[PDB]
Design a protein around this ligand. Structure first.
Ligand SMILES: [Mg+2]
Ligand SMILES: [Mg+2]
Ligand SMILES: [Mg+2]
Ligand SMILES: [Mg+2]
Ligand SMILES: [Mg+2]
Ligand SMILES: [Mg+2]
Ligand SMILES: [Mg+2]
Ligand SMILES: [Mg+2]
Ligand SMILES: [Mg+2]
Ligand SMILES: [Mg+2]
Ligand SMILES: [Mg+2]
Ligand SMILES: [Mg+2]
Ligand SMILES: [Mg+2]
Ligand SMILES: [Mg+2]
Ligand SMILES: [Mg+2]
Ligand SMILES: [Zn+2]
Ligand SMILES: [Zn+2]
Lengths: 57, 73, 48, 119, 62, 178
RNA sequence: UGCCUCCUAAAAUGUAACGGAGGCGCCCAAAGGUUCCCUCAACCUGGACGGCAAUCAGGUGGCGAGUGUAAAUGCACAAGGGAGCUUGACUGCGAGACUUACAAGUCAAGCAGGGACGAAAGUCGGGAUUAGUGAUCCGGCACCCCCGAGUGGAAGGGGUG
């Protein structure tokens, strides 16, 4: 049953708008999965109330 | 009253006992379920009737938590 | 609801068997591969 | 702990077929032991557990054999089939040992029938 | 189509009974032809049971 | 070769030996299996799972998923004993990492409110589980060729014997936390 | 008012009352046969809608679940759960036994023909067991071609289902 019922799954190079790209394997037809946000365009690297009257309110 | 009805008794129990020379095919133990289990030279039967398969004496014993009906021919 | 049916042979039409089936689960005629003593070999059997 | 699921669930299967398949003094029982490296086999005579003839795949007559692991199964099946015939044995029952029939064990069975063991 | 235009609108949900009756499969029975083997079906975006729905069209019991 | 797998035994396998004084390289954890299931409880009405529950998990994962059946009947859920209600798939080995990479890089940092996810969602062994709200933006699916949206939840099974060691393993792969 | 299970029943069998509790007059073309594999309920922790309880993962869990259907005896070795092909839910017999006033009822290894499954060993003459039934008479039907009221046929009779 590891034969011709599973969907098509070949290697797929993926690009982001940040420019950081990488090469994995997924089911997108053409190697053409396009994202606008990634895991290296963000931290996980480094990161009323009494301020009311300070505009002389 | 509402009760009062019974079924005919079925004459179960052990029929040939230990140390008893039996001929080939005699009913050793008639029962419901496998209260006794077939051992050497003893077949079970369609309603758990433990017939014999060979002439010879009958001896009883334990085999792994199930009590047995066997024949030393 | 379970009528008695009978299984005639398919080579020679002898009515060799008889049994029961459920008339609403099986609205069509049973086919089984049963023995036939006329022929001495297994053949097919439909109902009547 | 999958080195314990494999032992517990193969003497769970080995005792499943051992009920209906016994092996006696005229028709003994042939028990294979498929490890990941070798295979062992012996003929056991279940009335007093007296093994009549064994043939392992660890001594030099099988260790010096060219080929893969099935090729050392076809050789050891030619051993006990001609080690039975010094004890005078001609029909046996085949204990799978709990394993599946196919592969290394089925190549021992079809190489033990070509030398006498009538099963 | 070949030419022309078929303007539909998003204020319409389609239900289509057909001349070929191809939704009916001649191998399975009345309770699976319409209720797909399960027990409560969506009809009017509601929870009406299957056996009680087919019985509304005459097919009941046997 | 999946790039998260080569990243695994290169330095992370070296990292944990400094943290715990082990005596064998067999006691170091490794993620063994990752399990995804929809759990479509709505599927007990109208059978919207054929083009609805098999195909959508197929493009997310890569292989066809197992449709599961219910162990016993429940009246209030309108659910029998034997009706299809859940759709499970399982990821082992070299397909597991290619789901762990592509979750944690182009799908999981499409999840807002960056406290990561909770590091208190382990069980007592080192096995994690998080959830997803809708059919996420795994970009392999498209929003114009789907039925109604449906979430999922994703198990991750490890060889850990305690939670923080399982937390130490899964942090270093691409799971954000706080 | 017949049939099945328990108790009364005095530790074999058997045993009454208008004594005490319940069931049956069916169901299954797979819920049968076989080869192969698996272990439950309940409880705790983690989780999208999810709640005491749907689906998932991991722990502890030796029978407290399950058995088509009442109860008892049973069954984890599984008879419980799942899957692949199949029709032994056969035809010709049946040594020897159980029960038994009689009529009945029950069990049956083994022999052959022809099969199913299994690599073989082997198992299979319905169902975990015990109920789901009704004598004789007289008729119906299909087949075998046994007798055919002078002879050839026929009518009718007869036989095995
Ligand atoms: Mg009684
Ligand atoms: Mg059917
Ligand atoms: Mg008594
Ligand atoms: Mg007494
Ligand atoms: Mg079956
Ligand atoms: Mg079973
Ligand atoms: Mg019959
Ligand atoms: Mg007789
Ligand atoms: Mg034969
Ligand atoms: Mg064959
Ligand atoms: Mg027989
Ligand atoms: Mg019976
Ligand atoms: Mg009269
Ligand atoms: Mg005449
Ligand atoms: Mg006539
Ligand atoms: Zn980016
Ligand atoms: Zn015929």
């Amino acid at each position: 049953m590891k034969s011709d019922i599973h969907p098509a799954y070949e290697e797929t190079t993926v690009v982001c708008g940040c420019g950081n790209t990488f090469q994995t394997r997924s089911t997108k037809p053409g190697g053409r999965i396009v994202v606008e946000v990634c895991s290296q365009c963000h931290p996980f690297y480094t990161g009323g109330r009494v301020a009311r009257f300070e505009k002389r309110y | 009253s509402r009760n009062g009805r019974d079924s005919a008794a079925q004459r179960l129990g052990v029929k040939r006992y230990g140390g008893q020379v039996v001929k080939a095919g005699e009913i050793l133990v008639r029962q419901r379920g496998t209260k006794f289990h077939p051992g050497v030279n003893v077949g079970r039967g369609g309603d758990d009737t433990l017939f014999a398969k060979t002439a010879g004496a009958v001896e009883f014993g334990i085999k792994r938590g199930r009590k047995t009906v066997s024949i030393v021919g | 609801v379970r009528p008695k049916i009978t299984l005639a042979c398919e080579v020679c039409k002898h009515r060799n068997y008889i049994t029961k089936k459920n008339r609403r689960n099986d609205p069509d005629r049973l086919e089984l591969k049963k023995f036939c003593p006329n022929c001495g070999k297994h053949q097919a059997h439909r109902e009547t | 702990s999958v080195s314990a699921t494999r032992r517990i669930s193969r003497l769970r299967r080995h005792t499943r077929l051992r009920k209906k398949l016994s092996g006696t003094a005229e028709r003994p029982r042939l028990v294979v032991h498929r490890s990941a490296r070798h295979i062992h086999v012996q003929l056991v005579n279940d009335l007093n557990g007296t093994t009549v003839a064994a043939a392992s795949s660890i001594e030099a007559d099988v260790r010096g054999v060219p080929g893969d692991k099935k090729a050392r199964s076809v050789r050891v099946g030619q051993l006990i089939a001609e080690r039975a015939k010094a004890a005078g044995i001609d029909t046996v029952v085949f204990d799978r040992g709990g394993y599946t029939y196919g592969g290394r064990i089925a190549a021992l069975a079809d190489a033990a029938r070509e030398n006498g063991l009538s099963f | 189509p070949d030419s022309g235009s078929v303007k539909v609108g998003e204020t319409v949900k389609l239900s289509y009974v057909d001349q070929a009756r191809a939704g009916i499969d001649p191998r399975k029975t009345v309770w699976e032809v319409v209720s797909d083997g399960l027990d409560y079906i969506q009809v009017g975006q509601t929870e009406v049971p299957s056996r009680a729905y087919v019985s509304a069209f005459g097919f009941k019991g046997p | 070769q999946p790039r998260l797998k080569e990243r695994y035994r290169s330095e992370i396998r070296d990292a944990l030996r400094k943290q715990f004084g082990y005596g064998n390289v067999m006691q170091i954890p490794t993620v063994t299996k990752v399990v995804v299931n929809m759990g479509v409880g709505e599927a007990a009405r109208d059978a919207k799972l054929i083009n609805g529950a098999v195909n959508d998990l197929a493009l997310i994962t890569g292989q066809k998923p197992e449709v599961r059946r219910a162990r016993k009947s429940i009246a209030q859920f309108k659910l029998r004993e034997g009706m299809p209600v859940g759709v499970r798939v399982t990821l082992r080995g070299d397909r597991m990492w290619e789901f762990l990479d592509r979750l944690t890089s182009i799908a999981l940092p499409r999840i807002r409110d960056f406290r990561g996810l909770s590091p208190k969602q382990f069980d007592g062994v080192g096995n994690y589980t998080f959830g997803l709200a809708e059919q996420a933006v795994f970009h392999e699916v498209d929003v114009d060729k789907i039925d109604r949206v449906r979430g999922m939840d994703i198990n991750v099974v490890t060889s850990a014997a305690t939670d923080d060691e399982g937390r130490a393993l899964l942090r270093a792969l691409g799971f954000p936390f706080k």
